Subunit: 253 residues, 3 copies
C-alpha cells in the first residue's frame, strides 16, 4: 500500500539486470525478485536471493531501463533460505547512461535485519533515471539479497508530422454562399497501433473578408489509425482562395 499505483520493475520484467559476480549458476539475478521462492525440498535450484561470489564492498546489482523512469522507492529483502542479508547499501544512478551520480552523495541507506521482512526506502527526492544500482556496504553472513524498484507508470507516444495539406489554388471555397467545405483525405505514412489525436493548424491563408469579417477553419474528420479527412471550410459570404495546414498526430500506449 505504500507503493500502490507504482510499477514493480523486476516483477514486470521491465529492466535488464547485471550483477558484479554470482556465487554460481543458481545464485544469480534470476533469483533476485522481491519475495522470490524456490523448491525448498531440492537443493539444486539454489538460493532465494542473488548472492555475489566475491565478498567485499565492490559488489552491485544494476537495473537498466531504456525508457526513462521516475524512481520512487527501492525495496530490499534478505535471502529467504539462509540467514544472509544486506544491512546497508548505497545507490547510484544515471539518466543519460554516460554520467553517473550517487544518491545522497554515496552515503549509506538502511537495509534489512532478517531474511524476509521488506524494508522500503523512498528516495529523499524521486530519482529520474534509466539505470540504477544497489551497492551493498555492510551485510550479515554474505552479500545476498532480493529487491524491487518502484517507478511511476510511464506513458509512451508515437507521433507523425504531415506537412502542407492544401486545398489547391482557387479552390471551391472561393465561390458561393453558406457553409462550404473542401475535403482532402490524408493517409499517415504508417498505420498507428491505436487511435491517434490530431492537431491540424494553418500555415498559409489566402482569403477575402466579408463585411470586414474573416471566417476560416480546418478540422480533421473521421480519424482512424490509418488517416483522416482534412476538412477546410468557410461560411457566410466569405470567399477563400486557398488554405494550407500542417498536422501532428499522436497515439498513446
Amino acid at each position: 500500500m505504500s507503493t500502490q499505483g507504482l510499477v514493480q520493475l523486476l516483477a514486470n520484467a521491465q529492466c535488464h539486470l547485471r550483477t558484479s559476480t554470482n556465487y554460481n549458476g543458481v545464485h544469480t539475478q534470476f533469483n533476485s525478485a522481491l519475495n522470490y521462492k524456490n523448491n525448498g525440498t531440492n537443493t539444486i535450484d539454489g538460493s532465494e536471493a542473488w548472492c555475489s561470489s566475491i565478498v567485499d564492498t565492490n559488489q552491485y546489482i544494476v537495473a537498466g531501463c531504456e525508457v526513462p523512469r521516475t524512481f520512487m522507492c527501492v525495496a530490499l529483502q534478505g535471502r529467504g533460505d539462509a540467514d544472509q542479508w544486506v544491512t546497508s547499501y548505497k545507490i547510484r544512478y544515471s539518466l543519460d547512461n554516460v554520467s553517473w551520480f550517487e544518491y545522497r552523495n554515496g552515503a549509506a541507506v538502511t537495509g534489512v535485519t532478517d531474511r524476509n521482512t521488506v524494508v522500503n526506502h523512498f528516495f529523499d527526492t524521486p530519482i529520474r533515471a534509466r539505470s540504477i544500482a544497489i551497492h551493498p556496504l555492510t551485510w550479515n553472513g554474505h552479500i545476498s539479497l532480493r529487491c524491487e524498484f518502484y517507478t511511476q507508470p510511464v506513458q509512451s507516444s508515437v507521433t507523425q508530422v504531415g506537412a502542407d495539406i492544401y486545398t489547391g489554388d482557387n479552390c471551391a471555397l472561393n465561390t458561393g454562399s453558406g457553409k462550404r467545405e473542401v475535403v482532402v483525405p490524408v493517409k499517415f505514412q504508417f498505420e498507428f497501433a491505436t487511435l491517434p489525436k490530431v492537431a491540424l493548424n494553418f500555415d498559409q491563408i489566402d482569403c477575402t473578408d466579408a463585411t470586414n469579417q474573416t471566417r476560416i477553419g480546418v478540422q480533421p474528420r473521421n480519424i482512424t489509425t490509418k488517416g483522416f479527412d482534412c476538412v477546410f471550410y468557410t461560411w457566410n459570404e466569405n470567399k477563400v482562395y486557398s488554405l494550407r495546414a500542417d498536422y501532428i498526430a499522436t497515439a498513446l500506449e
Copy 2:
C-alpha cells in the same frame, strides 16, 4: 508463413524474461527460445527448454517490453531433448505494468503434444501489452517449454516543440510589394538522429488586407537534423506588421 512480417520477440532479444523457478542453472530462460538446441554430446549444458524447479500450476515465464506492443501470436514448443512439454496454458498480460489481466478470463489455450512440433495460437483479438506471461496448466513429464511471441513491428518517434518564432515588430513584410520573406534561423535544442519532418503554424497575426484579401504564409526551409530556416512570407501588395509561429519537429526510427 502464418507469422510473416511479425517481430519474433525472443529471437530478437526484444524482451526481458523472468521465470517463477528454474530446475537449475542450465534449465533457465536462457534456453527458452523457439527451436533452441544445444550440444547433444555433452550433458552439462542442460535442457533444450526452460524447465521449472517446482511442478505445480503456479509456474510461469514472463516476457517484458518497455515499449508497448500489439501481440498477434504466441507459439509453444516442447522440450527438444526429452519427452516433456506443456499441453495447455493460460496467458496473462499488462499494458501499464500496474494492473494485470487474463486472456479468455484465464481459460486454457491449447499447447503441444510432442517435443518439436510448434503450436501457434493467434489471439482471438490482438493484445496490447508491455508484459505477457505463459502460465502452464497441464503438462507431459515436466513443466518444460520453448516459446515465441509475435508482435506487429513497432515505430519509434522523437519530437521537439519550439515556441514563439517571431518576425519582429514592423518587419520587412510590412513594406514593399510582390513576394517578400523574413527568414528566422531555428536551432533544435538537440540534434535529431535522423531527418525530422517539421510542422510550423501560426499563433499570432498582425496584418493588413489588400483589397479585402488576407495573404500570409510560414514554411520551413533547409531542414537538417540540427535546425531549419523559418520562412515567414506574404505576396501581392499586402503589408504584414508581424507574424509568430510555433513548431513541432518529429524524427522516426
Copy 3:
C-alpha cells in the same frame, strides 16, 4: 577508453537484453560477458571471465536487443580473462525493424583479439542504426569465449500529448471593448507529464473583424505545468474577435 568518450556503454548500463546461441554451462553465460568482467579467481564454482559457447562451430552468437533504436558507433571485443581462449575474427549482423536482418560488410570478417585482456575496438565503417545487433564468431583460439561491449550515441526520449479544439466560445468577450483583451481557457493534460513540457498552440478556426483593415489575433499558453496550462486567446487595439479555436501539442523530454 578515450576513443569512446561520451558514448553509451550498453552492457555496462544494462541497456540491452542478451541472448546467446548456447552456454557451456550455467557459469559460462552472458551474465559473464561485460567488457572487463572479473570474478572470484580463488573459487572455481563461479566459472569463466567470459561468455563461452557449448557448441563450438561457426553458428554461435551473442545478440544484444534494444527496444529503442540506437546509433551504434563501435563494438569492442575482449578475450576470456581466466584462460587462453579468445575470438580472432567475427562477423556482425543487425536489424532495425526486428523483421529483416542485414550483414555488416555483407558478412565479411571483422578483426578480433589476440590475447585474453587487450580490448580491440571496431568502429563501424558507417554508424549503424539498429535495435538488435549480433556478434557471430568466425575463428577462435581454444574455444568460443568472449567479453564485449557496444557503444552508442546517447538517446533522447520524448513524450507528446495532442489536444484538440480549445475554444473561446461563440461571440466571446474579445468581440467587445477596446485595448488588450484576453479570454483564458484552462487546459488539463490527459495525463501528468514526468517533467515540464514545451507547448505549441496554434489556430484552426478564426472568426474576426478587422480594424481599419488590420487583423490582430493571438493565442499563447500561460502557466505551463506538468498537469496543464492556461490557453490565452487575445486581441488588442479596436479589433472585435467573435471566436477563435486552437489545437495544442505538448512535449516533455527525458
